[model samples]
Target chain A: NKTVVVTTILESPYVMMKKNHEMLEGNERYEGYCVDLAAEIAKHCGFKYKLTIVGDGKYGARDADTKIWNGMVGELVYGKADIAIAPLTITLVREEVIDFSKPFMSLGISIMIKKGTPIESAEDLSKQTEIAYGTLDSGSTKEFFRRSKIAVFDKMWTYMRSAEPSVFVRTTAEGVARVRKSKGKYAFLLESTMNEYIEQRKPCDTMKVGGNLDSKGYGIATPKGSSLGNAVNLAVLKLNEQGLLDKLKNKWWYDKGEC
Target chain B: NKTVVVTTILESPYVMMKKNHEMLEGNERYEGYCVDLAAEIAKHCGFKYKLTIVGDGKYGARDADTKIWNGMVGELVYGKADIAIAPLTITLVREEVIDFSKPFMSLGISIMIKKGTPIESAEDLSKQTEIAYGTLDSGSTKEFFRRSKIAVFDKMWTYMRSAEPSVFVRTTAEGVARVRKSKGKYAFLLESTMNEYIEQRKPCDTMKVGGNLDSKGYGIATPKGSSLGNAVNLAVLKLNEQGLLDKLKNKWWYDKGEC
Candidate 1:
């Protein structure tokens, strides 16, 4: 079989730059959940793979005016990569332009807050004006609130869109940092898996409070009608049933947990 | 120390009346996460406790017009129980009138849909008028929509509040059954932990979909300014650090997973 071009992003516990990435060559330069998943898929399907980070460091979303995609989703759609194996959420809109394997992991949008923060739920934040909250800029979480029919979320989006000083952060690391520095005033909303992973990291003052604001799963993506789609999907289900998915989760998230 | 009266609900996997409940006596009659948690807290805190179910089987909330408290929360507030240990979400409203320890378990509100349902998200359901939706009549989820300032949730509450045939159910079991029997026509909104638990049960036709609607944690509760509050709080933190909490969760939710 031909070599597969795997596009992913630099997200902690998903895909990350190895500690000695400069000395490591090829796939060894990168390590984490997605990298391992890509390897497993390739092994099961009898193919070779090259791990490459998405150029823009994004998961993928289309510009409204330009109607052009960006991020790993874009890479796959534009033939820049044969597959996207990252912490990319599978959504209805994305399914229209790309094909996704069955989910390899499940997660949801969650609130990351500093220890001692009084906020317990989104309603608590919405009812207050003191503590500021926001999501990663231009991601599925942002899209979720923007398009929600639920009153609290729609109102939250309205507040987030116009908040002075711009509550949105460019990356999960940036958002986590803001929460760490805000002294209980700033809350960063991101995917639950990342939130839990970060909670066990150094400077563990940050914690994921409350339940997730929504639920979804992460899937491997291929361009529309790609031949690799079915095999990858079946491989994911096989991993899930064989307990490999659960093992991978514990290996990356809990086994190495710092906190 | 005097025997601490622990107020809890008979919710499956959290606190349950055992199969030989009638034959068993006292603490032996009960089994679950909270039951184990209560035992651990008592062992660590060096106190004896009497496990007691709430008289009303409700988690607790105040009547808007009457200002009368009801459920396990009511039991604690009215001095009937010293602390609560069950699948009780720690909420701002509840916290204002009582005190809660650090969360022992975290969860979020999620959409529980049947396997073949076309709805993949709250947005998918909101845009269409075809399927019906509901929540536990008086739990944290129902209260969330009722009190949300966000537009979409408020809209959902409005729809649920006045949906001619009435969408709300009296219990989580009722809500789950509705989803199972609705045949893709109805969706139940409940906590993710419970949703996931039920999803792993026999006749596993239900699945949690989309992202969670909101995030929060369940904590042990005590009356406002109770002397036992601080000690109970520290006990919970100790259990978390010792990883007993995680062990208990896995024991009840996953170890016995039938699906």
Candidate 2:
């Protein structure tokens, strides 16, 4: 407990390493959505954390049938990482093993397609034949496909649950890369903002499709019964109420390159 | 003072008479979004109300530049309607003249579009396009067009404000009819629920675009400083926490297959 540990991801606008991150000696160098959030959590909980990336390329990874967290959550449960603050979608499946703070950001299932694909709406995607879709492995979008009752994603889930080749990617970067290189035919269903940010990035030729397929959000995940969970949860709410999230979105997404 | 006059819109699904309305008696025949919202408002405030429709087609028409409510707010100010519980948006200019209950349901500025439209996102519509897009008169969507700063929407405001022929519709119904007939060449922007309900209707081709362009909600509008507004505002919050709002949406919108 001498050095509190917090695991995060390299999701742009959420937690990108700052230009002077290596030069800076302390946590201030880690400035992005989650960095700002972690500072607020530390302020209220009276503890400092070493912001570190979760090992492994995959988030929330597990053996195909074992249902264990082999990524960030696994790091927390196994005592390597004290906490995780990422676009960690809260689901009942994950809730049983680790303690979670109330949602810090709300998101729903969404699809990222190369711009101007023939499909125009979620309904159209539902009735589609030519366009095949899948979600990232071990993320909220995948969970939604397995759980949602309506929309084309519900249809996609049935196809994905038993597809021969297995359509899940290990990370969002992989998914976006698929859309960019797939000649406008493949669509990756993922979190809406990430898709939107990618659409704004270089070689920007993709856009999110349909409205979000479901409603949920990211929660702070910790080892079960961790003392810091509740305080971090309230800190998340405080930051949200004080309009810090909007500021972070602007800083990381809009103002970064300009800065 | 005896019967609080409530003003509502005749939006189908939100406010509709029963199929037996022609033969059915009194209040029993009228049921929809406003009908039940009025009932809840009255129940919480300990008052009896008579649901009345604003005779004028305008949502809150008045001196558009002066920011005064000429129709429904006129009724409330003139002592005709004690509470306005329709699908009403609370705007800054309106807040000066009226008191709005805390938003019962939050929505953002939204756009309604049909299948095969060239427009896919708000950004697309904002680009210099001859494709027509505007909002309902004195409505949330229109206000959004008038007040937005999002790059595309601001551009839209620039185009819409001085177009050769104004594309604004006076009522939600008129807007809906135009969108249905315009073959995706025209888009209607309105409150989210109205957009959702419309998207659920036939030819059933429309979809709400850009999620919501802004975030706020419909509230029960009353004369500013009215004693009734205080109690009604708290009641709306309670209903939301109790899951009553979600239940109400299901009852009126989902149950009727309105989406």
Candidate 3:
């Protein structure tokens, strides 16, 4: 079989550039938790693969106005890539168009704040007018708020959709950067894994606080009806049962954490 | 079975003075989450019960100077109450002295800030002196901060202990009142369960901000080696499996939420 194409995001820890990325080619150009994970899965499934970053640099989201998908989800839908191996969330809307392997990791939405900013939960952000807060644009988190049945979440989404200066950012980095630059004026909401990773990084002036806002999981994705889906799913379950997933998680998250 | 005396606190939505409490007697004088929980447990275990408020008006803390426990733990240990049915957090220190039922409810430490406050997280509170934050003077939350091993939590404990005019309060009510009257200058740290309940109450001037600072569970308590312990634990688990716990939470919290 030809080299199976893989689509991923550049979100830190999940997928990132190696120090000598310029001298490397193809999959060698990048390394991260997902990078190693993809390698392991391919070894177990007996498939060769090539890695490519998402075209739009997004986790993935469907545009409300155009009803068109974007990010890695789009790449898979349009047949540009065979699999998505990043920290892509397993969401209901996305599941309709593509198939996902059993979850490799579980996470939830969380709050990130500058060291001295007073924000705890989404309810905190919803009631106050002084500090601005938001989630990454075109991600499960944004969709979560927009489609929430709970009153507080719906209330927050209403505020976010029309907030001045726009609370949404295109990427997680932009959201974190905004939280840092805003000097306690802003709080970023993102997945717990990413939020905890950032909290352990340099500057270390920001921290992940509160419990997760919601619970979800990240899955390896393949095109709907793809023959590769079953193999990947079995590979994930095998790794999980063998404790490889937990070991890799420790290696990538806590073992390397700066904090 | 004869009537088993249960000790609880008068915290809002946990155990509170019913509106017609003045005209009521015995167990009829109270209504809240814990009140309902106690009734459920008693019914499942085929025991008659009486609800009595904690005498110290604290959640229980060990005095550093005397090493004596105060509050509900004290009540259970000293036989003042046959069981504790309040929002009594399960902790290692307390478990050494008394027995706790399997958690019937789960929660974590969270921040409660008045609307328009600037604080978002414990780290945020740790970095600034402008806004004061504290937990119940004698509860598991205060104990958590006091015994924390993490750097952020340890740092917070230092600030809380040294803050002028004493940041801690004798009761959750006092903590909530401080947040309300301080006009955004004070933040209260408590269990998310209570924080969420208060956030939905009238006036709606305070919100549970950030996510939980730490995760723990609340359990029914009996003196260590008590014959009633196993039965109480099993009852809680049965209620949880039957979805009665969820129903009770909705009835006391969301169903009555004014905000």
Candidate 4:
């Protein structure tokens, strides 16, 4: 009776610690969209599991010099975790090393601006120098800019790479806080799911603006050739058809919205 | 060198014959979104290929009693084609016997109504029998209703299963034609990609109404564990990142809009 070790992150509305976490034990201490999803997946697949936050708080990217992966992806690659149930973006580089279920959720890189900001689209942000924009460090959004060949995104990436104070932040919260406190001077680029969730929270001073820069999805990942891939993939599709996935999205992102 | 046999259907904008087909030869006789995509896929994967219309002209479905797959899916399962690059949907049952690349495009089951139809949503359609609604025969949309456990969908399916006039149609063209001539008496349910495309064409009397019923995507499929899966999947992602997918959508669906 081996317990599956599930690795994930602590991103809000996906996975978060309960207010009374000090008294809680094991998986009982956490709750959010992924938490509920993990429970459903386990029930459908007939597995007992223990949830563990990735040792490195990252979504996963490979270092250029060392060729080592970090974040939840690394956890799976190194066999520290049996499965990753998180907001992990599926990418070509990552897919070669792991198997991804059909997207559990679809998202894209989108702009988040303060309510009074004049920015309307990525093109707008790229065309002007008065406002500064940045993406979370070591994530897919940043990678998108770094690798983009389109004129607008390529120009934006060039500016970001050479910006005066380093526009990138360590976490999504840091990026949101920068946008909140920088008044109309700063904007954050992040996934639409997170941008929409934050927009409905207290204060409500921030808003998602414009169409997404690219389209993709967050997937449940497993090490290549893992036995868990097949059953989990089927479970995801079944849950999606049953509308449980949408219901879970509403539960975490909107049901408790303060705004 | 073996020429890969590509299986597809003649859906508008996906794969359709050119008006000058009588003067063209082989693959040159057809042109549309999938035709273009097939060329790109072949170029990237370094393979020579031939496009063949599916023998059954179906997207694919399993017969209840005989348990046999039909359409492009059957072509792949029965070794009649090496690949299918049509608007074939990625479903759980199909995925069991074949492989799907990451979605090339995202869509959902949507409602198509004649202009000014009183209906607004699936719930709206479920509440009244005055407006008869149906789906394409042997398709994912039909299967969605048949398998759904949700209240509104279950009720709608019960009605459709027993409807007096036999609400199922053999093709998308038939469903759209029914909507056009029904004079507000019928609504056709189909994928959003097709619905949106039809809305922009001549006569433009049909409009896609409300939000989609469920979310999914159309994938490029190969037989289970095919060697081409790896390269094809990577090429799809690369093309998406390069903005080619969106560019093609604009090319066929909206660029030539008559309305």
Candidate 5:
């Protein structure tokens, strides 16, 4: 039997290289929430799988002109991988190209502010010019702002797009670093899952502020019409019902909380 | 083109009879969240449909002896309904015989305690004998307790299964009424969506306590491999992205809040 190929990414607390990764071999080189999820999924579905990082390091967006999908979603779409087990969002556009199991984890676009910041809501951020706000480039948060027509979000998008300093960051870590370094003047918008995780880490000056901007979930994905989709979907539901998914989230995100 | 047959239930704020329902004809007789959702979905998917109430008025559960599915779920499985646009829960057993769009609304098992009740959590309920608790029969909440292996939930199930006068209620209204009449002696375990709505209703003597016991969502469902599944699923995501779902929720849930 062919080994199932799982395409993923190196997002903190979801998938990260072990500190001594050089000494580890194959799948053992990685540790995190998604890594654990993949292992359990494979075992439940009775398939062997190999974990491979996406080539582009992006979270899968389409090039407007070329119309080509890149990142883990592309790997599945282009037949480079059999499935994608990452923090890949279950977006409508992506759903058209690949199959996704019902969400194993729920999250939302959220505001991350340095502790002691005066911001408490999205409307608060939009109403003031003293604090700057931005989202990760080529991610759902950016897409949400760009596509939003709600007055507050539309106004925020206009400000971010025209701001002289280019508020967008290439990576989540860069966004967090910006928030930490900007004192009380900068705010980061990102997924609640990652925001909450970062808040638990050392040097935890960052706090998730405001209710989430929207509701959504991250799903395990496979190519459209794949034979494995059924078994994998069932496995996800089984794992969630058994409380294993919750356990993995706690183990990766809060077990070693530093603050 | 054949009209889509939609099976749904008369659940308040989600679906309920109009005050003069008997005089109204066809779909005009019903109103609420699911009724609005069904119309939007049909318009987007370009289908004509008729809404029919389920025969048994149950939410669907498999009988232990016959393994037969009942309620709205059976309507889909047995070809009586083309789609089920109700507050049908997206669950593991149900997923096997049918298809569900990504959730249109998220909810969880929650406690509805009369105002001034001493209990704050499931653990509090489990540890007390004076304040009795129960869930709606033949629904996800009851199934959750019956199937849970967690220590707290398992212990609660033990008490519920053998309670002297029977703690379970036949309907959400009955359970809520029990809580109202029992004063502080009874707490109803029901879905947070309904619990929150009831909290805002007139004579609002009850309140949802603590955090939810579990997390899940309500999904629009169709028979497995139905051709309409794709268009309907995409429509749900489109509506969600456009903020229509949130708008509908607010219009029904909070716009009329009296508390």
Candidate 6:
């Protein structure tokens, strides 16, 4: 088979280069936890693949105004890449178009408050009427709200749909950065793992509150019923069954950056 | 002023007769919990009113082939009644066209497991492939599914939407009755107070299990912005601010069934 282009973003621990970055070469550059995952998928499915950044320097999605698809998954969704090996989630609406493998990992939507931001629960988040909050544009966090049933958020939908300065962002990195600069005024919603990861990073005195709001799982999705989809799905199940996913999690989260 | 048409259902306690139930007057034949609420709305809003049983007698709504409205609230929505004083929880989609007063009571969507059912957490509920659980047709419970962002309910929505002969109930009472008779297979979703109230009544082997799934308060609602709407909203706020809502809770649920 030809070289399969696997699309991904630069979310650290998920997909980031190891030390002595200049020495690492093609495919090897994809270190970190997701890199380990890529290594396993390759071995399990017996398919050779190469890791590449998604188009637009972001995740996969279309520019609605431009009617064009970009990002890694965007490319795959539009036939540029053959598969996505990122921590992308499976959404119902998206599921209708792009088939996803059974989940490899599951997490909840979480909030990072600057230590004493007065928010403690999802219920509290909705109860506060004046504190305006936002999520990364076109990412899993945003999708959670886009698919929620709570009433306050429906009011928020009206606000978000008409924000003047454009409330959308392409990544949680940008969202957490925005939260840092905006201070307590803006709360950042992202995956719990990533949110906790950022909280420990520089100038990240922020603390995660309210646990996870929704149950989200990472899935390897191929265009619906693609030839490689079945093999990839089985590979994920195999990795999960063999506890390799757990090993990857420990290597990326607990052992790194030292206490 | 026109007589405010309050929609009702033939549920026990909420609308069942008193000891003098049979001998009492015409409309007074139905004088229970929700009946008291209807009278309270009239008194608080200072409006003359008439109570009408929802025409079809189904609890709230269902995806039945019929096009006409099914429950009291539906009747109100489709111009059949002026108001519905049923124990309806406030949901976002419903809040869109119609308006609700500040919650007169707080409630959660709980599961009713027959005495020895295995399901405990909601996740447990969703995993069960054979034990069928459902909600009242077109009631606050269905709204819970229609408006949820949580995991189990989101998954359950697909099952309910496509269940054979449908998974909807006309009223909370009907759904509860179905659960009792289904011999541990069916679980009904209803207000916590309602569940507790039912559990306390005689011949009540059935009990609510798995606790609450969501948090919301039930409110008195009116069409978007009628004069009566403003009055009821103010009355509701006043009652809530004055701690009258809690007082009424005790009166209805705990203070012995003499209203």
Q: For model 1, what is the alpha-carbon lDDT of residue A249?
A: 82
Ranking by lDDT: 4, 5, 1, 3, 2, 6
Tens digit per residue, CA lDDT, model 4, A1-259: 6899999999998999999899999999999999999999999999999999998799999999999999999999999999999999988889888889999899999999989999999999999988999999789899999998999999999999999899999999999999999968999999999999999987899999999888898889999999999999999988988899999998888888889
- TM-score each candidate: 0.53, 0.54, 0.53, 0.98, 0.98, 0.49
Q: Which CAPRI category fits model 1?
A: incorrect
Candidate 3 CAPRI category: incorrect
lDDT of 2 at A31: 65
Stretches of candidate 2 exceeding 4 Å from the true structure: A1-259, B61-68, B128-130
- Shares of reference contacts reproduced by the candidates, in order, are 0.00, 0.00, 0.00, 0.56, 0.41, 0.00
Q: Can you give the lDDT of residue A89 in candidate 6?
A: 72
Better of 3 and 6 by lDDT: 3
lDDT of each: 0.84, 0.72, 0.84, 0.93, 0.93, 0.68
Each candidate structure's count of clashing pairs: 23, 1, 17, 0, 0, 10
Across A121-173, the per-residue lDDT of candidate 5 in tens digits comes to: 99999999899999998987899999999999999999999987999999899
- Write the residue-wise lDDT of candidate 2 on B1-259 in tens digits: 5878788767777678889688977567788877887788688778987777787745674575885556677777667788887777655556556776545665666778876777766778877466788887566567666765556667889888887577788778888888889967788877788888777776777878776665555678888678886577667755653446667887776676633
Off by over 4 Å in 3: A1-259
Instruction: Name the runs in model 6 displaced over 4 angstroms.
Output: A62-68, A129-131, A161-168, A202-204, A257-259, B1-259
Deviation from native of the Cα of residue B240 in model 1, angstroms: 1.0
Greater DockQ among 3 and 5 belongs to 5
> Candidate 5: deviation at residue B106, Å?
1.0
Which window of 10 residues has the lowest lDDT sum in candidate 5 chain B?
Answer: B135-144
DockQ for the candidates, in order: 0.02, 0.04, 0.02, 0.74, 0.70, 0.02
- Name the 10 consecutive residues with the lowest summed lDDT in model 5 chain A: A250-259
The positional error of residue B57 in candidate 4, measured at the CA in angstroms, is 0.5
Q: Write the per-residue lDDT of candidate 3 for residues A18-107, one digit (tens) a residue.
A: 997899898998988999999999999899999999888877777779988889999998899999999998775677688776567767
Give per-residue CA lDDT, model 2, range A1-259, as digits (tens).
5678898888767777779678886565766788877877887788878988777844674566876668787888788888998878665556657766645665666778888788766677667657766788776567666765554556778887776566678778888888888787777888877776777787768887777655555778899878886567657645643446656766666665331
- Stretches of candidate 1 above 4 Å error? A1-259
